[PDB]
Design a protein around this ligand. Structure first.
Ligand SMILES: OC[C@H]1O[C@H](O[C@H]2[C@H](O)[C@@H](O)[C@@H](O)O[C@@H]2CO)[C@H](O)[C@@H](O)[C@@H]1O
Ligand SMILES: OC[C@H]1O[C@H](O[C@H]2[C@H](O)[C@@H](O)[C@H](O)O[C@@H]2CO)[C@H](O)[C@@H](O)[C@@H]1O
Ligand SMILES: OC[C@H]1O[C@H](O[C@H]2[C@H](O)[C@@H](O)[C@H](O)O[C@@H]2CO)[C@H](O)[C@@H](O)[C@@H]1O
Ligand SMILES: OC[C@H]1O[C@H](O[C@H]2[C@H](O)[C@@H](O)[C@H](O)O[C@@H]2CO)[C@H](O)[C@@H](O)[C@@H]1O
Ligand SMILES: [Ca+2]
Length: 516
C-alpha cells in the first residue's frame, strides 16, 4: 500500500439490503438462510435503510418501529450484525431505486414560507429531503426521530455494529443538483439550488454580516451595487462556472453554499451522538457522493461538483472530523476517462479523497456506485480498498450475489477477506548503505507487482542481520511475492532469486522465512 505500509487490519466487507421491505422480496425464513450464506462468504454485516416515511407516517410523534424490530430479530437469528441507515430522504427518483417512499407529508405543513424545500436556477422545485437551511425544523424533527429510535431498538443493541445518518438526497451530504426534471442528469452540468426566497435572504444576511454594510461589500467585491436587494445568487450558472468563480464574489458565494452543508454535518452529528452514544456506543458515519463527471471540462471546470456543494474537499472533511463522524465515499469500481462529452475522472477523485482523509485521521469506508456484473470490477475495488487504507467496503446490492453463485464466489476470493498479521523474514540480502528492502506480490493487498507506489517496507534487524516486518495479509488465500532492493534514489537495484509463495496464508500468526 501507499507509503510503504500494507492493508488496514480492521477491514470488513458489508452487504447492502434491498430498497424494499424483506416481505415484498422473499419471506423471513429464506432471508435468514441467505444471511448465513452471506456470512460464509466473508460478509460481516448487512446495511439497511429504515425510511422516515414508514417510521413516522401518520403525524408528528406517531411512531411505528415494528418493521425495524422484526428485521433486527431475523438478523439475531441468523447470527449477523446490521448497520441501520436512518433515512430521512425519499426512496424513488435516483439511480437504481425501485421503491417509492416519500418523507412524511405533514412535515411540509409546519411552515408557510419556502424555507423547507429547494428551487433551482430555472425554477424547478425539489422536495426529496429537507433543506439544511431550515435548521430549527431539522433540530426538532431529527432530534425526536433519533431518540424514539434508540428507545425502541435498545433490545437489539448487540446486533447493531454501526449507525448511518442521511445528510441529503440518496442518503448523501449534498444538494439535489443532478436530477431528471431539472435537466441536470449525468453527464450534464449541475444547476445551483439556492433560489428560494429564504435562501436569497440567508445569503444576503451572511454577506452583510461578513462586511457590515453595502459599502464594504462593493469595496471587497469591487462592484457597484446600488441597493442591498441586489446581493443575489448567480443569475447565470454557466457563466458563473466558466469564470465568475474566480472573482471575489465567486469565492464568497461558494464559501456560503458549501458552508451550509458543513454546518448541517455538525448539527446532525451532535443530535446523533446525544441520542445513541450511551445506549449503543457504536461509530456513527455519513456519506459523500462521487460526482466524477465534468471534472476536467475546460470550459466549465468541476462543473457538476460545485452545484452539488463540493468546492473544497479538505474544508468539507474537517466538518466530519469535528462532528465525530466516519466517512463513506460511494464510487470505487470505475476507471478514469477524461474525454468529451463527459469529462469523467472517478479514480483520480477517489485517490484525492482518500489521501485527505488519511492525512486528517478520518476512518474511511467505500462503496460501488453501480451494480457489478463482472470480476474485473471487483479487482479495481480491491486495488483501491487495499492500497488506500479503507476500513470497509459495502457492496450494492443483495440480489447481485445472492442469486449468482459464480459472482458470489469471485467476491469471496477477492473481497470477502479476513486480515491477519504475519511476520515476513528475508535472509542473505546484499544490502549496501542507503538501500531499503521492500516486498511486492500478486494480490492487491501486496500491491500487484508494483514497485513505485505500493510495495510494503521491511526493516533491518541488526542482531540476526536480516530484513523483516509484520505485514497484514488475506487469511487463507494463496499469495506469491518477491523481495527487492530500492537504492538511496528510488531505483530497483535487484530482485530476490526465487519467487516465494504461501499456499495458503495460515489464519493464526506465524513467520515465513526465506533467503535471497
Ligand atoms: O446519488 C446518485 C449517484 O450519482 C452518481 O452515479 C452516477 C454514475 O456514476 C454514472 O456512471 C451514471 O450512471 O449516473 C449515475 C447517477 O447520476 C455518483 O457516482 C454516485 O456516487 C451518486 O451517489
Ligand atoms: O441503500 C443505500 C442507498 O442506496 C441508493 O443510493 C446509492 C446509489 O445507488 C449509488 O449510486 C450512490 O453512489 O450511493 C447512494 C448512497 O449509498 C438509494 O438511492 C438511497 O436512497 C439509499 O439510501
Ligand atoms: O450579488 C451580486 C451579483 O452577483 C451575481 O453576479 C455575479 C455573477 O454571477 C458572476 O458570474 C460574475 O462574474 O460576477 C457577478 C458579480 O458582480 C448575480 O448574477 C447578480 O445579479 C448580483 O447582483
Ligand atoms: O512485473 C510483473 C512481474 O514481477 C515480478 O517479476 C520480476 C522478476 O521477479 C525479476 O526477477 C525480474 O528481473 O523482473 C520482473 C519484473 O519486471 C514477478 O516475479 C513476476 O511473476 C511478475 O509477472
Ligand atoms: Ca417529530
Amino acid at each position: 500500500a501507499v507509503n510503504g505500509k500494507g492493508m488496514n487490519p480492521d477491514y470488513k466487507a458489508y452487504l447492502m439490503a434491498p430498497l424494499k421491505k424483506i416481505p415484498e422480496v422473499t419471506n423471513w425464513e429464506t432471508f435468514e438462510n441467505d444471511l448465513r450464506w452471506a456470512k460464509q462468504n466473508g460478509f460481516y454485516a448487512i446495511t439497511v435503510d429504515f425510511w422516515w416515511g414508514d417510521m413516522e407516517k401518520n403525524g408528528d410523534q406517531q411512531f411505528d418501529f415494528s418493521y425495524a424490530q422484526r428485521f433486527a430479530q431475523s438478523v439475531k437469528n441468523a447470527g449477523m450484525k446490521m448497520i441501520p441507515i436512518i433515512s430521512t430522504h425519499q426512496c424513488g427518483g435516483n439511480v437504481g431505486d425501485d421503491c417509492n417512499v416519500p418523507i412524511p407529508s405533514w412535515v411540509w405543513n409546519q411552515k408557510s414560507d419556502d424555507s423547507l424545500y429547494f428551487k433551482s436556477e430555472t425554477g424547478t422545485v425539489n422536495k426529496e429531503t429537507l433543506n439544511p437551511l431550515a435548521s430549527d425544523v431539522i433540530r426538532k424533527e431529527y432530534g425526536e426521530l433519533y431518540t424514539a429510535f434508540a428507545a425502541a431498538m435498545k433490545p437489539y443493541k448487540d446486533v447493531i455494529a454501526k449507525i448511518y445518518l442521511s445528510g441529503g438526497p440518496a442518503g448523501e451530504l449534498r444538494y439535489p443538483s443532478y436530477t431528471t426534471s431539472d435537466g441536470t442528469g449525468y453527464p450534464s452540468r449541475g444547476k445551483f439550488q439556492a433560489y428560494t426566497e429564504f435562501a436569497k435572504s440567508k445569503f444576503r444576511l451572511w454577506v452583510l454580516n461578513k462586511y457590515g454594510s453595502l459599502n464594504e461589500v462593493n469595496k471587497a467585491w469591487g462592484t457597484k451595487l446600488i441597493s442591498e436587494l441586489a446581493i443575489l445568487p448567480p443569475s447565470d450558472g454557466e457563466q458563473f462556472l466558466m469564470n465568475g468563480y474566480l472573482s471575489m464574489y465567486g469565492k464568497d458565494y461558494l464559501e456560503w453554499y458549501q458552508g451550509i452543508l458543513e454546518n448541517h454535518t455538525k448539527l446532525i452529528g451532535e443530535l446523533a451522538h446525544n441520542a445513541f452514544d450511551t445506549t449503543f456506543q457504536v461509530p456513527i458515519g455519513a456519506k459523500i457522493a462521487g460526482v466524477h463527471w465534468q471534472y476536467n471540462n475546460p470550459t466549465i471546470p468541476h462543473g457538476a461538483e460545485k452545484p452539488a456543494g463540493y468546492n473544497d474537499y479538505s474544508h468539507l472533511l474537517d466538518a466530519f472530523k469535528s462532528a465525530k463522524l466516519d466517512v463513506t465515499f460511494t464510487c470505487l469500481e470505475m476507471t478514469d476517462k477524461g474525454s468529451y462529452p463527459e469529462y469523467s475522472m472517478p479514480k483520480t477523485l477517489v485517490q484525492n479523497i482518500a489521501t485527505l482523509a488519511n492525512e486528517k485521521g478520518i476512518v474511511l469506508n467505500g462503496e460501488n456506485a453501480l451494480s457489478i456484473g463482472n470480476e474485473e470490477e471487483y479487482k479495481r475495488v480491491a486495488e483501491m480498498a487495499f492500497n488506500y487504507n479503507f476500513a470497509g467496503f459495502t457492496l450494492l446490492r443483495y440480489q447481485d450475489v445472492m442469486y449468482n453463485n459464480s459472482l458470489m464466489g469471485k467476491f469471496k476470493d477477492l473481497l470477502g477477506v479476513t486480515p491477519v498479521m504475519q511476520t515476513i523474514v528475508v535472509k542473505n540480502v546484499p544490502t549496501t548503505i542507503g538501500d531499503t528492502v521492500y516486498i511486492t506480490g500478486n494480490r492487491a493487498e501486496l500491491g500487484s507487482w508494483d514497485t513505485k507506489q505500493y510495495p510494503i517496507q521491511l526493516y533491518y534487524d541488526s542482531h540476526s542481520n536480516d530484513w523483516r516486518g509484520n505485514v497484514v495479509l488475506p487469511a487463507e488465500r494463496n499469495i506469491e511475492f518477491k523481495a527487492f532492493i530500492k537504492s538511496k534514489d528510488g531505483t530497483v537495484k535487484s530482485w530476490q532469486t526465487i519467487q516465494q509463495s504461501w499456499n495458503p496464508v495460515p489464519l493464526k500468526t506465524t513467520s515465513h522465512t526465506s533467503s535471497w
